[PDB]
Amino acid sequence: MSVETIIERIKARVGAVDPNGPRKVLGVFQLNIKTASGVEQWIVDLKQLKVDQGVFASPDVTVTVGLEDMLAISGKTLTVGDALKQGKIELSGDADLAAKLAEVIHHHHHH
């Protein structure tokens, strides 16, 4: 519905989320929204809680997903595991790093 409405949730969440929340990691990722008009690139940092638009000078990992997909996720409806099974989220670069994200699919006691 709007790429902007997707990142907005990320910035609003990051500024409220905790560092210990996610897995033990720290770096930067390169997100890309696949659209018929092209591809919306976005920069995200793990270390801190910030968000930037464009292509990082040298991101740790490059992920490419569709707009619709990001909608179900960012909209707080679908789960990372679901989108992964479908194949909407494409990986490229340091799969090892990107893997840390999918790991969240697990159901542990403490995050």
From TrEMBL:
Pfam hit, one: SCP2
InterPro entries, A to Z: SCP2_sterol-bd_dom, SCP2_sterol-bd_dom_sf
Protein name: Sterol carrier protein 2-like 2
Organism listed in the record: Aedes aegypti (Yellowfever mosquito)
Lineage top rank: taxon: Eukaryota
Positions of the SCP2 domain: 23-104
GO cellular component term of the entry, any: cytosol
Cleaved signal peptide residues: none
